Amino acid sequence: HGSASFLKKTMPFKTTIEGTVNGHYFKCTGKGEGNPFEGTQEMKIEVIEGGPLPFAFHILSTSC
Amino acid sequence: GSASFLKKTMPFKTTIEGTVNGHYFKCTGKGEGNPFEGTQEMKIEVIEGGPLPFAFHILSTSC
Amino acid sequence: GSASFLKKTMPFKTTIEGTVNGHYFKCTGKGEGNPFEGTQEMKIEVIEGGPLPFAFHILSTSC
Amino acid sequence: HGSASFLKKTMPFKTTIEGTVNGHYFKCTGKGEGNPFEGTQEMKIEVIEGGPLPFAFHILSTSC
Amino acid sequence: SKTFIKYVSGIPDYFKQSFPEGFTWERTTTYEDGGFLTAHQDTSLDGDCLVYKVKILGNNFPADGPVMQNKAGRWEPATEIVYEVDGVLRGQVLMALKCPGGRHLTCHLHTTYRSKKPASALKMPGFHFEDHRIEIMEEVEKGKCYKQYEAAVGRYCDAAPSKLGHN
Amino acid sequence: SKTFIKYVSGIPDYFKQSFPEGFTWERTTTYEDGGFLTAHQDTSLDGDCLVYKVKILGNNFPADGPVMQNKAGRWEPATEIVYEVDGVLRGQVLMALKCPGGRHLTCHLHTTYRSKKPASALKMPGFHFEDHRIEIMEEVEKGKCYKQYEAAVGRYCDAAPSKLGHN
Amino acid sequence: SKTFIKYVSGIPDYFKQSFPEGFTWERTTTYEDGGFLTAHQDTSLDGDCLVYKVKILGNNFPADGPVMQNKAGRWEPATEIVYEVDGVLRGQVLMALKCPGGRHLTCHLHTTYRSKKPASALKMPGFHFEDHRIEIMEEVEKGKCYKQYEAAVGRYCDAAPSKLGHN
Amino acid sequence: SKTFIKYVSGIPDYFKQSFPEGFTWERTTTYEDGGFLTAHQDTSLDGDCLVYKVKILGNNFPADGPVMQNKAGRWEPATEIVYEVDGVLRGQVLMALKCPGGRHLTCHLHTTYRSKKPASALKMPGFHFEDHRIEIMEEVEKGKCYKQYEAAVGRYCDAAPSKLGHN
């Protein structure tokens, strides 16, 4: 690639999450941006069905 | 009384959707059994993702 | 014939030594049962490390 | 402690290992030396009963 | 398909008590060679016919193992332990899939059974066993059609009695 | 103490076939709250008396759990699955310790049973079940003396029969 | 979101290599207190935008545990081991919820990562580690909206170097 | 041999703090192919010389597996998570045997480390990582004599820093 000047510095992403945990159905959407080669990213996740979640959001962190 | 909604012989039908090891599949099924005698039979048809690339045995308890 | 060495009622004795969660203990025991009927009883005595600081139940299957 | 000049640079050790794995009894002894603050060490382990081991020595590595 | 169980002795029937609303179950099965098979199910009653809706996610099955190679034999029977937890029912069972070469590939089912009725409307069973025999009766079409049978019995440990008055 | 089992139906008795030499067993029990209890045992016959020698290593039991708090209730009965592996016998069973507050603390026993006779001298059983009921009959002295009973039966799944001729 | 990893020491990037087609992953997380969380994910590339589609099935979380009590604090950082199996990548990692009060609740993730490219078009990495730092920067609304950050580094165990030249 | 660890970033050294009295540890290692290896160890200090006493019980290793076939290659490096539980230290780590042929066989170590000093005399470390590099430098004689090296570093996950100032 020569140098970092020819790599994409940032890349957006969108997500949809659907599931059931202990019998509770939920759906989420999400939007974020990251730096693919620096290995960092940030996103906002919203629960659009089944909110507020009756369990800790943390069990969904690795799936987002 | 809850059990009054049940009969000595009852039919059932099923719909199954899933992914196993990256492989998507869908099934339907139809059976009949005697609920109070504890016996049942059914026929399952893979309608999408067939022929399955894995042993059907792993779906037995879900049907 | 192997089973000819056994009787309808037989005694047994045991010695147990172990450590659980840092706690050392020793037991002996003596029992009797009917091997072919599948029944048995025994008495276990903690001779070292008693009174145990944990539930005896975790040693039941080892006795 | 002030500085490293007042720490023990190296410390010897000795070990005895006794056990049974899949019904095979063995006993080992060992001798070694390490640097406690640099976090390195070396040892020689000898099987004195039940050798040669009928299983991979590697399952004993973390116990030595 | 837990509505089909013959209960003996005193044992309350959580499933047949749950109608007409029905019940759900949720399960993860762990296989000894690394596979996981997770399933959620809904059981409803549509005028005389039971209706099942199932979602499955399975993963980590070894490519060289009997499941992904499609060289499994058959299921042995099994005995599930069943007891109340968190006002619903929990079950655990070890199953064993016979495979070529005299192998048994075992797995461990962890299930929660949830009535759609409130727990106050239910007579909850004590700790007990469910014997289950599941058999693939016919491979009608290699990986496209199968016929399956099951018999189940909810019981206590009758063969080896208590000396203290316990079930 | 596996010499004490009532076998029914055709089932060969691995343990009573192993005399006068005897047998060993090796086991790790995993508890759902993190405890491990590992045991090795030797069973010999000293003129009419069976002699057991046991070594135990247990670890990782939670300080706040029923075991380390010494506030366990009692064992439920259980059903072990038993089958041939590597020319010896393997067993697996889920046990459940009743504890205060309506809790069941379950564990999973993984055992290998090894005859001291060569496998060629033995009639190996097919896959089967051993029902086991173990009961602490008396706490004679709080954490110093106990009396324990066991009944066991080796059997097939009789309550829920095969439609394909299988045990 | 595995496209966003900084690889050092020349470790091949399985994820970036898989585009434009993308990749999937499949995972079961087992919690020490009995919970299971299974997920399947699809990753594709729609022009310049990554698109994720995820399905989740979770079960057997204890009603009295930190998850169902909504009493989780925050994730510790973690280090996944990643290596080739069956021509795809396997990962395993132990994560730990630092709950409010100091106590950690751990879990064990078992993952397969599958390129949509054929294995012959890919340079596979050897055994290596992936550090993951995931953090909730803001609970915008309690069970409804979250801002999450992650940093991830693919590396070898360089802090304790090999005396034989191994990675 | 946990006395030989390089701690960075000011992490308290539970092991060095425990002397002169020393410490114990207890461990069960569960292998992915069914094996269990349980060990208890005592560490004391006899003048200037450390003395280790270890007891081992291992079982259920498959006769066809790399361990009982004596077909293990070498251990990968690994990273243990270490944290306080019940006023002592818990550790968990996933290790991987790199077998001859490329395939890895993994295992999961569950350890408790217990000081012989009372917890009030100790500064406990927070959650952190221990890198371990263990290597056979020489098979002097095949199943009889080995020279082994280890390096170990106690650290935080610094490669992927927190955006909130957490370790």
PDB file of all heavy atoms in Angstrom, chain H residues 42-73:
ATOM      1  N   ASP H  42       2.119 -27.081  47.832  1.00  0.00           N
ATOM      2  CA  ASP H  42       2.609 -26.276  48.940  1.00  0.00           C
ATOM      3  C   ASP H  42       3.940 -25.625  48.578  1.00  0.00           C
ATOM      4  O   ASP H  42       4.836 -26.274  48.048  1.00  0.00           O
ATOM      5  CB  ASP H  42       2.769 -27.124  50.185  1.00  0.00           C
ATOM      6  CG  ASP H  42       3.147 -26.301  51.381  1.00  0.00           C
ATOM      7  OD1 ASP H  42       2.299 -25.671  52.039  1.00  0.00           O
ATOM      8  OD2 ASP H  42       4.351 -26.242  51.717  1.00  0.00           O
ATOM      9  N   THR H  43       4.056 -24.333  48.881  1.00  0.00           N
ATOM     10  CA  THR H  43       5.293 -23.588  48.711  1.00  0.00           C
ATOM     11  C   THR H  43       5.750 -23.089  50.080  1.00  0.00           C
ATOM     12  O   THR H  43       5.029 -22.365  50.778  1.00  0.00           O
ATOM     13  CB  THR H  43       5.106 -22.411  47.731  1.00  0.00           C
ATOM     14  OG1 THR H  43       4.812 -22.911  46.413  1.00  0.00           O
ATOM     15  CG2 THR H  43       6.425 -21.614  47.578  1.00  0.00           C
ATOM     16  N   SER H  44       6.942 -23.499  50.477  1.00  0.00           N
ATOM     17  CA  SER H  44       7.570 -22.932  51.669  1.00  0.00           C
ATOM     18  C   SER H  44       8.984 -22.442  51.371  1.00  0.00           C
ATOM     19  O   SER H  44       9.496 -22.624  50.268  1.00  0.00           O
ATOM     20  CB  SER H  44       7.554 -23.937  52.819  1.00  0.00           C
ATOM     21  OG  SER H  44       7.972 -25.211  52.396  1.00  0.00           O
ATOM     22  N   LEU H  45       9.599 -21.794  52.361  1.00  0.00           N
ATOM     23  CA  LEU H  45      10.933 -21.229  52.212  1.00  0.00           C
ATOM     24  C   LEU H  45      11.812 -21.764  53.333  1.00  0.00           C
ATOM     25  O   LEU H  45      11.603 -21.444  54.498  1.00  0.00           O
ATOM     26  CB  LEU H  45      10.867 -19.703  52.236  1.00  0.00           C
ATOM     27  CG  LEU H  45      12.180 -18.934  52.082  1.00  0.00           C
ATOM     28  CD1 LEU H  45      12.872 -19.232  50.754  1.00  0.00           C
ATOM     29  CD2 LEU H  45      11.917 -17.444  52.218  1.00  0.00           C
ATOM     30  N   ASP H  46      12.778 -22.589  52.937  1.00  0.00           N
ATOM     31  CA  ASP H  46      13.693 -23.308  53.811  1.00  0.00           C
ATOM     32  C   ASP H  46      15.047 -22.611  53.741  1.00  0.00           C
ATOM     33  O   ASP H  46      15.893 -22.970  52.926  1.00  0.00           O
ATOM     34  CB  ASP H  46      13.784 -24.753  53.298  1.00  0.00           C
ATOM     35  CG  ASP H  46      14.776 -25.607  54.062  1.00  0.00           C
ATOM     36  OD1 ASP H  46      15.444 -25.219  55.046  1.00  0.00           O
ATOM     37  OD2 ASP H  46      14.930 -26.782  53.659  1.00  0.00           O
ATOM     38  N   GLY H  47      15.241 -21.603  54.587  1.00  0.00           N
ATOM     39  CA  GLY H  47      16.433 -20.773  54.536  1.00  0.00           C
ATOM     40  C   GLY H  47      16.402 -19.852  53.328  1.00  0.00           C
ATOM     41  O   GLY H  47      15.610 -18.912  53.276  1.00  0.00           O
ATOM     42  N   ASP H  48      17.261 -20.125  52.351  1.00  0.00           N
ATOM     43  CA  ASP H  48      17.259 -19.374  51.094  1.00  0.00           C
ATOM     44  C   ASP H  48      16.659 -20.176  49.934  1.00  0.00           C
ATOM     45  O   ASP H  48      16.546 -19.662  48.827  1.00  0.00           O
ATOM     46  CB  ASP H  48      18.681 -18.916  50.757  1.00  0.00           C
ATOM     47  CG  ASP H  48      19.102 -17.704  51.575  1.00  0.00           C
ATOM     48  OD1 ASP H  48      18.733 -16.570  51.201  1.00  0.00           O
ATOM     49  OD2 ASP H  48      19.788 -17.789  52.608  1.00  0.00           O
ATOM     50  N   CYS H  49      16.252 -21.418  50.195  1.00  0.00           N
ATOM     51  CA  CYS H  49      15.765 -22.309  49.139  1.00  0.00           C
ATOM     52  C   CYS H  49      14.244 -22.482  49.193  1.00  0.00           C
ATOM     53  O   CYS H  49      13.689 -22.829  50.228  1.00  0.00           O
ATOM     54  CB  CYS H  49      16.433 -23.683  49.248  1.00  0.00           C
ATOM     55  SG  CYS H  49      16.052 -24.819  47.879  1.00  0.00           S
ATOM     56  N   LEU H  50      13.581 -22.247  48.069  1.00  0.00           N
ATOM     57  CA  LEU H  50      12.153 -22.541  47.952  1.00  0.00           C
ATOM     58  C   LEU H  50      11.953 -24.047  47.858  1.00  0.00           C
ATOM     59  O   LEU H  50      12.755 -24.745  47.247  1.00  0.00           O
ATOM     60  CB  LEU H  50      11.558 -21.859  46.726  1.00  0.00           C
ATOM     61  CG  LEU H  50      11.549 -20.336  46.771  1.00  0.00           C
ATOM     62  CD1 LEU H  50      11.344 -19.771  45.359  1.00  0.00           C
ATOM     63  CD2 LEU H  50      10.471 -19.850  47.726  1.00  0.00           C
ATOM     64  N   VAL H  51      10.904 -24.550  48.496  1.00  0.00           N
ATOM     65  CA  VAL H  51      10.581 -25.973  48.437  1.00  0.00           C
ATOM     66  C   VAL H  51       9.117 -26.157  48.048  1.00  0.00           C
ATOM     67  O   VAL H  51       8.214 -25.603  48.677  1.00  0.00           O
ATOM     68  CB  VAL H  51      10.911 -26.704  49.754  1.00  0.00           C
ATOM     69  CG1 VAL H  51      10.181 -26.093  50.921  1.00  0.00           C
ATOM     70  CG2 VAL H  51      10.620 -28.202  49.648  1.00  0.00           C
ATOM     71  N   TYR H  52       8.906 -26.953  47.010  1.00  0.00           N
ATOM     72  CA  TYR H  52       7.581 -27.226  46.483  1.00  0.00           C
ATOM     73  C   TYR H  52       7.221 -28.683  46.743  1.00  0.00           C
ATOM     74  O   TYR H  52       8.048 -29.577  46.563  1.00  0.00           O
ATOM     75  CB  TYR H  52       7.527 -26.973  44.975  1.00  0.00           C
ATOM     76  CG  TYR H  52       7.991 -25.621  44.496  1.00  0.00           C
ATOM     77  CD1 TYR H  52       8.458 -25.466  43.191  1.00  0.00           C
ATOM     78  CD2 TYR H  52       7.955 -24.486  45.314  1.00  0.00           C
ATOM     79  CE1 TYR H  52       8.881 -24.232  42.715  1.00  0.00           C
ATOM     80  CE2 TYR H  52       8.386 -23.245  44.844  1.00  0.00           C
ATOM     81  CZ  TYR H  52       8.842 -23.127  43.540  1.00  0.00           C
ATOM     82  OH  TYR H  52       9.249 -21.903  43.058  1.00  0.00           O
ATOM     83  N   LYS H  53       5.978 -28.913  47.153  1.00  0.00           N
ATOM     84  CA  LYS H  53       5.441 -30.254  47.356  1.00  0.00           C
ATOM     85  C   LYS H  53       4.134 -30.313  46.587  1.00  0.00           C
ATOM     86  O   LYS H  53       3.212 -29.568  46.900  1.00  0.00           O
ATOM     87  CB  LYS H  53       5.170 -30.524  48.842  1.00  0.00           C
ATOM     88  CG  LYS H  53       6.412 -30.521  49.743  1.00  0.00           C
ATOM     89  CD  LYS H  53       6.366 -29.410  50.828  1.00  0.00           C
ATOM     90  CE  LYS H  53       7.251 -28.202  50.450  1.00  0.00           C
ATOM     91  NZ  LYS H  53       6.649 -26.860  50.715  1.00  0.00           N
ATOM     92  N   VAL H  54       4.044 -31.188  45.593  1.00  0.00           N
ATOM     93  CA  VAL H  54       2.860 -31.224  44.736  1.00  0.00           C
ATOM     94  C   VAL H  54       2.233 -32.622  44.663  1.00  0.00           C
ATOM     95  O   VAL H  54       2.931 -33.640  44.598  1.00  0.00           O
ATOM     96  CB  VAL H  54       3.121 -30.553  43.337  1.00  0.00           C
ATOM     97  CG1 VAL H  54       4.492 -29.867  43.290  1.00  0.00           C
ATOM     98  CG2 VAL H  54       2.950 -31.496  42.198  1.00  0.00           C
ATOM     99  N   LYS H  55       0.904 -32.646  44.750  1.00  0.00           N
ATOM    100  CA  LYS H  55       0.109 -33.863  44.597  1.00  0.00           C
ATOM    101  C   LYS H  55      -0.764 -33.707  43.358  1.00  0.00           C
ATOM    102  O   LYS H  55      -1.368 -32.650  43.162  1.00  0.00           O
ATOM    103  CB  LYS H  55      -0.791 -34.078  45.806  1.00  0.00           C
ATOM    104  CG  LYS H  55      -0.091 -34.058  47.158  1.00  0.00           C
ATOM    105  CD  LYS H  55      -1.130 -34.046  48.282  1.00  0.00           C
ATOM    106  CE  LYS H  55      -0.576 -33.508  49.583  1.00  0.00           C
ATOM    107  NZ  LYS H  55      -1.084 -34.306  50.736  1.00  0.00           N
ATOM    108  N   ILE H  56      -0.855 -34.772  42.557  1.00  0.00           N
ATOM    109  CA  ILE H  56      -1.557 -34.759  41.278  1.00  0.00           C
ATOM    110  C   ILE H  56      -2.521 -35.947  41.147  1.00  0.00           C
ATOM    111  O   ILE H  56      -2.183 -37.068  41.512  1.00  0.00           O
ATOM    112  CB  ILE H  56      -0.532 -34.770  40.111  1.00  0.00           C
ATOM    113  CG1 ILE H  56       0.310 -33.500  40.144  1.00  0.00           C
ATOM    114  CG2 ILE H  56      -1.236 -34.929  38.745  1.00  0.00           C
ATOM    115  CD1 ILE H  56       1.331 -33.415  39.058  1.00  0.00           C
ATOM    116  N   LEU H  57      -3.718 -35.668  40.636  1.00  0.00           N
ATOM    117  CA  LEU H  57      -4.681 -36.686  40.213  1.00  0.00           C
ATOM    118  C   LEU H  57      -5.206 -36.262  38.851  1.00  0.00           C
ATOM    119  O   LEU H  57      -5.789 -35.191  38.717  1.00  0.00           O
ATOM    120  CB  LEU H  57      -5.846 -36.784  41.197  1.00  0.00           C
ATOM    121  CG  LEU H  57      -5.549 -37.390  42.569  1.00  0.00           C
ATOM    122  CD1 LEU H  57      -6.816 -37.336  43.406  1.00  0.00           C
ATOM    123  CD2 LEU H  57      -5.012 -38.830  42.495  1.00  0.00           C
ATOM    124  N   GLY H  58      -4.957 -37.090  37.846  1.00  0.00           N
ATOM    125  CA  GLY H  58      -5.431 -36.873  36.488  1.00  0.00           C
ATOM    126  C   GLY H  58      -6.233 -38.059  36.019  1.00  0.00           C
ATOM    127  O   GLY H  58      -5.966 -39.199  36.392  1.00  0.00           O
ATOM    128  N   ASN H  59      -7.241 -37.806  35.201  1.00  0.00           N
ATOM    129  CA  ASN H  59      -8.145 -38.859  34.787  1.00  0.00           C
ATOM    130  C   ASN H  59      -8.881 -38.508  33.513  1.00  0.00           C
ATOM    131  O   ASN H  59      -8.886 -37.362  33.090  1.00  0.00           O
ATOM    132  CB  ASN H  59      -9.138 -39.176  35.907  1.00  0.00           C
ATOM    133  CG  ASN H  59      -9.763 -37.934  36.501  1.00  0.00           C
ATOM    134  OD1 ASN H  59     -10.638 -37.323  35.882  1.00  0.00           O
ATOM    135  ND2 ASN H  59      -9.284 -37.520  37.668  1.00  0.00           N
ATOM    136  N   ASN H  60      -9.470 -39.531  32.900  1.00  0.00           N
ATOM    137  CA  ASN H  60     -10.372 -39.396  31.763  1.00  0.00           C
ATOM    138  C   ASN H  60      -9.693 -38.868  30.487  1.00  0.00           C
ATOM    139  O   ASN H  60     -10.360 -38.377  29.566  1.00  0.00           O
ATOM    140  CB  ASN H  60     -11.593 -38.541  32.121  1.00  0.00           C
ATOM    141  CG  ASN H  60     -12.538 -39.242  33.080  1.00  0.00           C
ATOM    142  OD1 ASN H  60     -13.266 -40.154  32.693  1.00  0.00           O
ATOM    143  ND2 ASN H  60     -12.548 -38.801  34.336  1.00  0.00           N
ATOM    144  N   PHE H  61      -8.371 -38.971  30.437  1.00  0.00           N
ATOM    145  CA  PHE H  61      -7.640 -38.651  29.217  1.00  0.00           C
ATOM    146  C   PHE H  61      -7.947 -39.751  28.200  1.00  0.00           C
ATOM    147  O   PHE H  61      -7.851 -40.935  28.521  1.00  0.00           O
ATOM    148  CB  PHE H  61      -6.132 -38.529  29.486  1.00  0.00           C
ATOM    149  CG  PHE H  61      -5.750 -37.271  30.207  1.00  0.00           C
ATOM    150  CD1 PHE H  61      -5.639 -37.256  31.593  1.00  0.00           C
ATOM    151  CD2 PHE H  61      -5.499 -36.095  29.505  1.00  0.00           C
ATOM    152  CE1 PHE H  61      -5.275 -36.096  32.268  1.00  0.00           C
ATOM    153  CE2 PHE H  61      -5.138 -34.927  30.183  1.00  0.00           C
ATOM    154  CZ  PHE H  61      -5.038 -34.938  31.569  1.00  0.00           C
ATOM    155  N   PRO H  62      -8.359 -39.368  26.995  1.00  0.00           N
ATOM    156  CA  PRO H  62      -8.706 -40.358  25.967  1.00  0.00           C
ATOM    157  C   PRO H  62      -7.457 -41.119  25.498  1.00  0.00           C
ATOM    158  O   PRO H  62      -6.409 -40.517  25.242  1.00  0.00           O
ATOM    159  CB  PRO H  62      -9.321 -39.505  24.846  1.00  0.00           C
ATOM    160  CG  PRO H  62      -8.769 -38.138  25.049  1.00  0.00           C
ATOM    161  CD  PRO H  62      -8.525 -37.986  26.510  1.00  0.00           C
ATOM    162  N   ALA H  63      -7.561 -42.439  25.435  1.00  0.00           N
ATOM    163  CA  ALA H  63      -6.448 -43.281  25.009  1.00  0.00           C
ATOM    164  C   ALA H  63      -5.936 -42.894  23.615  1.00  0.00           C
ATOM    165  O   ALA H  63      -4.748 -43.049  23.332  1.00  0.00           O
ATOM    166  CB  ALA H  63      -6.845 -44.753  25.051  1.00  0.00           C
ATOM    167  N   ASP H  64      -6.832 -42.367  22.773  1.00  0.00           N
ATOM    168  CA  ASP H  64      -6.489 -41.944  21.404  1.00  0.00           C
ATOM    169  C   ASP H  64      -6.061 -40.470  21.282  1.00  0.00           C
ATOM    170  O   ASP H  64      -5.737 -40.007  20.190  1.00  0.00           O
ATOM    171  CB  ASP H  64      -7.638 -42.274  20.423  1.00  0.00           C
ATOM    172  CG  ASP H  64      -8.924 -41.464  20.680  1.00  0.00           C
ATOM    173  OD1 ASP H  64      -9.088 -40.666  21.629  1.00  0.00           O
ATOM    174  OD2 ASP H  64      -9.891 -41.628  19.898  1.00  0.00           O
ATOM    175  N   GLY H  65      -6.019 -39.748  22.404  1.00  0.00           N
ATOM    176  CA  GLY H  65      -5.669 -38.338  22.400  1.00  0.00           C
ATOM    177  C   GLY H  65      -4.171 -38.088  22.454  1.00  0.00           C
ATOM    178  O   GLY H  65      -3.399 -39.005  22.724  1.00  0.00           O
ATOM    179  N   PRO H  66      -3.744 -36.857  22.176  1.00  0.00           N
ATOM    180  CA  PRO H  66      -2.315 -36.540  22.162  1.00  0.00           C
ATOM    181  C   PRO H  66      -1.594 -36.803  23.479  1.00  0.00           C
ATOM    182  O   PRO H  66      -0.419 -37.123  23.433  1.00  0.00           O
ATOM    183  CB  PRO H  66      -2.293 -35.054  21.789  1.00  0.00           C
ATOM    184  CG  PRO H  66      -3.578 -34.840  21.081  1.00  0.00           C
ATOM    185  CD  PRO H  66      -4.564 -35.694  21.788  1.00  0.00           C
ATOM    186  N   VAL H  67      -2.269 -36.677  24.624  1.00  0.00           N
ATOM    187  CA  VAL H  67      -1.628 -36.896  25.918  1.00  0.00           C
ATOM    188  C   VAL H  67      -1.265 -38.371  26.122  1.00  0.00           C
ATOM    189  O   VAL H  67      -0.112 -38.690  26.383  1.00  0.00           O
ATOM    190  CB  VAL H  67      -2.500 -36.390  27.095  1.00  0.00           C
ATOM    191  CG1 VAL H  67      -1.922 -36.833  28.455  1.00  0.00           C
ATOM    192  CG2 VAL H  67      -2.617 -34.866  27.040  1.00  0.00           C
ATOM    193  N   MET H  68      -2.236 -39.268  25.996  1.00  0.00           N
ATOM    194  CA  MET H  68      -1.984 -40.673  26.278  1.00  0.00           C
ATOM    195  C   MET H  68      -1.219 -41.324  25.122  1.00  0.00           C
ATOM    196  O   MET H  68      -0.585 -42.358  25.314  1.00  0.00           O
ATOM    197  CB  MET H  68      -3.284 -41.426  26.579  1.00  0.00           C
ATOM    198  CG  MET H  68      -3.998 -40.955  27.847  1.00  0.00           C
ATOM    199  SD  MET H  68      -2.979 -40.812  29.332  1.00  0.00           S
ATOM    200  CE  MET H  68      -2.275 -42.429  29.384  1.00  0.00           C
ATOM    201  N   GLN H  69      -1.245 -40.695  23.942  1.00  0.00           N
ATOM    202  CA  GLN H  69      -0.434 -41.148  22.802  1.00  0.00           C
ATOM    203  C   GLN H  69       0.988 -40.603  22.848  1.00  0.00           C
ATOM    204  O   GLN H  69       1.819 -40.979  22.013  1.00  0.00           O
ATOM    205  CB  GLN H  69      -1.082 -40.762  21.469  1.00  0.00           C
ATOM    206  CG  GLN H  69      -2.339 -41.548  21.136  1.00  0.00           C
ATOM    207  CD  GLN H  69      -2.066 -43.001  20.790  1.00  0.00           C
ATOM    208  OE1 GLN H  69      -1.186 -43.298  19.979  1.00  0.00           O
ATOM    209  NE2 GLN H  69      -2.815 -43.908  21.403  1.00  0.00           N
ATOM    210  N   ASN H  70       1.274 -39.723  23.810  1.00  0.00           N
ATOM    211  CA  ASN H  70       2.595 -39.118  23.966  1.00  0.00           C
ATOM    212  C   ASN H  70       3.003 -38.422  22.657  1.00  0.00           C
ATOM    213  O   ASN H  70       4.106 -38.612  22.132  1.00  0.00           O
ATOM    214  CB  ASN H  70       3.620 -40.171  24.422  1.00  0.00           C
ATOM    215  CG  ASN H  70       4.772 -39.577  25.237  1.00  0.00           C
ATOM    216  OD1 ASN H  70       5.468 -40.303  25.950  1.00  0.00           O
ATOM    217  ND2 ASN H  70       4.982 -38.266  25.128  1.00  0.00           N
ATOM    218  N   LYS H  71       2.067 -37.608  22.162  1.00  0.00           N
ATOM    219  CA  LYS H  71       2.137 -36.938  20.866  1.00  0.00           C
ATOM    220  C   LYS H  71       1.817 -35.450  21.040  1.00  0.00           C
ATOM    221  O   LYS H  71       1.213 -34.815  20.174  1.00  0.00           O
ATOM    222  CB  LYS H  71       1.135 -37.588  19.904  1.00  0.00           C
ATOM    223  CG  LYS H  71       1.681 -37.851  18.522  1.00  0.00           C
ATOM    224  CD  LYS H  71       2.574 -39.094  18.481  1.00  0.00           C
ATOM    225  CE  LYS H  71       2.833 -39.556  17.039  1.00  0.00           C
ATOM    226  NZ  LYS H  71       4.236 -40.003  16.834  1.00  0.00           N
ATOM    227  N   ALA H  72       2.200 -34.910  22.191  1.00  0.00           N
ATOM    228  CA  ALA H  72       2.083 -33.487  22.448  1.00  0.00           C
ATOM    229  C   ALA H  72       3.323 -32.837  21.838  1.00  0.00           C
ATOM    230  O   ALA H  72       4.388 -33.449  21.773  1.00  0.00           O
ATOM    231  CB  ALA H  72       2.005 -33.220  23.941  1.00  0.00           C
ATOM    232  N   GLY H  73       3.179 -31.610  21.368  1.00  0.00           N
ATOM    233  CA  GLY H  73       4.307 -30.889  20.838  1.00  0.00           C
ATOM    234  C   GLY H  73       4.866 -30.000  21.915  1.00  0.00           C
ATOM    235  O   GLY H  73       5.836 -30.339  22.585  1.00  0.00           O
TER     236      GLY H  73
END
